[PDB]
Write a protein that binds this ligand. Structure first.
Ligand SMILES: O=S(=O)(NCc1ccccc1)c1ccc(S(=O)(=O)N(Cc2ccc(Cl)cc2)C2CCCC2)cc1
Length: 144
């Protein structure tokens, strides 16, 4: 379909350049990386400090480039524990200029112990342009 081809073109043109997470109350960095955790088809891994689970809110900054124009770039993220969805989050960026690089700041508002969670949490992220699914990716989390 034209839509399927279009999703593939958007994916081809997309890269997540860097990302970080902060305690929203203190602004201290909890995590930073330059690995593109959005790449589909491989299980990514990340290690986060266990204090993140006690945060009332986390601020995320995600820097991305896109060759393609998007009308309504958005994300759906599911938190899976042993295969069970515990939480679903929605984030909207909106319009994306073709051949742009953009920083996207979002707030994530709030648990089992870190020792139970560690290695058993998968974040499933779906990237959309409006209702067109561009890609699905997965990251397994370890709490350190
Ligand atoms: O572990 S958490 O502190 N809380 C999730 C949770 C766990 C158990 C029960 C409920 C909620 C957490 C999980 C995921 C995120 S996240 O911002 O979606 N994020 C995953 C992520 C972010 C962006 C993209 Cl494109 C793909 C995946 C990670 C955290 C490690 C590297 C960046 C931020 C915090």
């Amino acid at each position: 379909s034209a839509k399927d081809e279009r999703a593939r073109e958007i994916l081809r043109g997309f890269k997540l350049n860097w990302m970080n997470l902060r305690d929203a109350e203190t602004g201290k960095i909890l995590w930073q990386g330059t690995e593109d955790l959005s790449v589909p088809g491989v299980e990514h891994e990340a290690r986060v400090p266990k204090k993140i689970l006690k945060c009332k809110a986390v601020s995320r900054e995600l820097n991305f480039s896109s060759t393609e124009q998007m009308e309504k770039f958005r994300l759906e993220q599911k938190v899976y524990f042993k295969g069970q969805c515990l939480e679903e989050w929605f984030f909207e960026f909106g319009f994306v200029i073709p051949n742009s690089t953009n920083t996207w700041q979002s707030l994530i508002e709030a648990m089992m112990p870190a020792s139970v969670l560690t290695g058993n949490v998968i974040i499933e992220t779906k990237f959309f342009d409006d209702d067109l699914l561009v890609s699905t990716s997965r990251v397994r989390l370890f709490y350190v």
